[model samples]
Target chain A: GGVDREAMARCIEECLRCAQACTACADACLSEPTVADLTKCIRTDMDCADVCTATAAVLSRHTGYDANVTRAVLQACATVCAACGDECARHAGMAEHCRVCAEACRSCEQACQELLAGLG
Target chain B: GGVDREAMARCIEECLRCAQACTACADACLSEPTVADLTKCIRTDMDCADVCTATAAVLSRHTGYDANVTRAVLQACATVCAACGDECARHAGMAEHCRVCAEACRSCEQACQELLAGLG
Candidate 1:
């Protein structure tokens, strides 16, 4: 049987968007005058970006899809996104990039959870 | 403190090489006349390629390095590479692409493990 194409597509798109946003937010944080204070945020952003990219790529392929792998990856991605979103939100008041990134992370997290619920 | 630059550089290079090889192998498998039989190989190749790409990106960043995240990503990458390598090796007898890809996966898995060991 084939997978849920619509859910997969939405999750993939969210993952890609979140990856880009996290990458951009990390670079932006690096350029901030108080970069030393943003170390944890930068670390979280980098981790989130990498996970989202991997999740997106995994979701893109459908042939011989493994539900277990998909579920595991999505769970991991959601976890990272939640952590990143929380970190970014702390700086959202000061940095526009963080605000944007936080939004992206929240959306991605929601999308992953929704997809996972449908996986059953 | 910064990461072990030399080890990180080597692992990054290997990850990139593995990602390219897996992507190529998946495409090659798709082009094969017996593509139906190679579905699992293609799926594994895609997963490995995605994981390697994410691992490389995570390694490329140095600011606010998180040892835990690095270790986890490397472990995941190594796992995916091993699975992909085993799948590709099964087709190495007939497909040159699979042979090259299997070599790449093995090298990447080794690199990830070495890096993880050094992270301690």
Candidate 2:
């Protein structure tokens, strides 16, 4: 709550950006020619987007946020971001949306890691 | 991907409901006289709302959800709901909004737990 004010804000901003990017990427994947082939990627994007969205929303109103719980979600967000980033990177060259989404995930991953270390 | 559609839908609904309730509760808390006393509760409400919101959004597009990741988020959601519910309950007598929020959190906790065990 009162902890890591600066880092928390940065992390929240990154989370929102990543959420938007992932949402856009997932929607783009659905429109691509081989949607079936990108099913896994699409799922990963959606999951990552959801976590980021929640993380951003939660941190925005930080008041009684438990340190342990916050750390758990931060770690989870980072994990998902990394997984989604890897998936998107695989198709980054073929799909511009994937490239953008991957970049966002990388940024969010860094943000979470930085904030998480300072959460204590 | 192929999971309990009915249960998933139910959990998502509960999550959305809880999110709305928590958001409202937090806003209401801001208007209370002893806002300081409700600081922890507001933060808990916001955190709970965020997780529920994310859980709902992710489940809505459950195309390629990794069961492991889904389970992790579900557990996190439940944990937050429980913590938030307890906090809201502490303020329920003084604030009607907290009463309603506590109810929503309880429902969401139930939904998360029910869905968690069958997540395999």
Candidate 3:
């Protein structure tokens, strides 16, 4: 009837956190004096955010069973999380938003990876 | 102030369509006789559907502009659409829902790809 919430609790939280962090990072980037300079960081931040949203939604629904799809998505999410984290780290020192996003990204990556490893 | 709706209209519509189609497919999968066998397909369907939802939301918001984020999301969405379509196609013969899902995924893939191509 519903998803196994206990198993996905941490991941769900992490995804939601990352989504907010990225969105905030993107918004903050626009407010910067040289918004143009942080375009890459903002872009990656949004990408990671959106994917995290999708990942959380999928994991929240358990009525439909599909390990292959979940695995692929987890991997896709992991890929983006790492990329976003790496990109954010580049600007962590200059921008507080980037630093926050990097933290969220790293956490999300770990949460997803741990679950994925268990799934396999 | 806002995103260029005119440019994103088609892609937005497609993403919405794919989201609905995949959601429907996942629901339908649960009703199949051999639901166990269709796990992979169903999982992918859900994954694709959620991603589509997130993608549409991201594109709809233009207050924060980040070309890199948009481009990366487009690529990620396209990649998932293709994967979901291929997986759904394998079940197209037996599941009408999957057939519909496959079509939607392909259309979404094309739409995202078209827009992404122009981004450069």
Error of 3 at B109 (Å): 6.9
* Chain A only: TM-score per candidate: 0.96, 0.93, 0.92
Candidates sorted on TM-score, descending: 2, 1, 3
Q: Candidate 3 — which pairs collide?
A: A43-B69
DockQ of 3: 0.23
Best by lDDT: 1
Question: Model 3: per-residue lDDT, tens digit, B1-120?
Answer: 343455589999999989999888988987999899898788778778888887887687664356666776677678779888998899889978888889999999999888887777
For model 3, residues A16-119, the per-residue Cα lDDT tens digits are: 99989999998998799978888878877877888898888878766445565566667767777888898889888888888888999999998888878777
Clashes of each: 0, 0, 1
- Give model 1's docking category: acceptable
Off by over 4 Å in 1: A1-10, A27-47, A110-120, B1-6, B117-120
TM-score of each: 0.79, 0.85, 0.65
Name the weakest run of 10 consecutive residues (lDDT summed) in model 2 chain A.
A57-66
Ranking by lDDT: 1, 2, 3
| Interface CA RMSD of each prediction in angstroms | 2.6, 2.0, 5.0
The docking quality of candidate 1, as DockQ, is 0.36
| Model 2 error, position A104 (Å) | 2.3
* Model 2 C-alpha lDDT per residue in residues A10-100, reported as the tens digit of each score: 8999999999999999999999998889998999988998899878866676456577667767877888898899999999988889998
Candidate number of the best DockQ: 2
Summing lDDT over every window of 10 consecutive residues in candidate 3 chain B, give the lowest-scoring window.
B61-70
